[PDB]
Structures are given as structure tokens and as C-alpha cells.
């Protein structure tokens, strides 16, 4: 019986843009998508624990 | 000559803290980083 799976986390800014600063400036226009994804992944990790 | 385009040393950060109602000190965790390199 499987019990837990891999705990993973995403860095939204580095994934979407990498290391371009003005691209992150453009991301600032998209609101709290990254926060939502981070919260979901953190919930998944604590759920696995 | 070949130049490894290593991404500028990148790594995740995480702050361990008790409630501000209790104290103010914090601890910092750099996961995936050997801290002879910080």
C-alpha cells in the first residue's frame, strides 16, 4: 500500500522567468497566482508528512 | 573554450520563527546548499 509520495515545491518566479528582473515586473501584474500554487504545494507536502 | 552557463548560484530559502507574540529571533535555512558556499 502506498503511503506517501514525493514532496515537491516550485519557485514561481524562477520557473516562469528565470533571472530576468523586468519579466518578474511583468509577473507582478498577474497577482497572486504564484502564492496560490505555493500554498497548494505546501499543503501537499505537509499532508504527506 | 566551453563555458558552463551555471545559473547564478540559485537556491530556496526558508525562515524558522516562533510566534512574534513570543519572541523575535529567527533562523534561516538554505535547502540544497552546503554552507561553506555562503
Amino acid at each position: 500500500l502506498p503511503v506517501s509520495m514525493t514532496k515537491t515545491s516550485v519557485d514561481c518566479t524562477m520557473y516562469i522567468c528565470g533571472d530576468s528582473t523586468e519579466c518578474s515586473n511583468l509577473l507582478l501584474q498577474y497577482g497572486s497566482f504564484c502564492t496560490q500554487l505555493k500554498r497548494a504545494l505546501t499543503g501537499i507536502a505537509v499532508e504527506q508528512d | 573554450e566551453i563555458l558552463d552557463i551555471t545559473p547564478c548560484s540559485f537556491g530556496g530559502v526558508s525562515v524558522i520563527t516562533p510566534g512574534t507574540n513570543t519572541s523575535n529571533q529567527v533562523a534561516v535555512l538554505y535547502q540544497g546548499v552546503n554552507c561553506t558556499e555562503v
Partner: peptide, 20 residues
């Protein structure tokens, strides 16, 4: 033995020794 870019694989809280 029989089982083998902004993305990080967080280690589990409980090590294999603790579960064992």
C-alpha cells in the same frame, strides 16, 4: 533494493531509520 529550475524535492520529515 527492489525499488529505485525552481523545482525542489523536499526530503521527508521521517528518515528510513525512524520508520524502520
Amino acid at each position: 533494493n527492489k525499488v529505485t529550475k525552481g523545482l525542489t524535492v523536499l526530503p521527508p520529515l521521517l528518515t528510513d531509520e525512524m520508520i524502520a
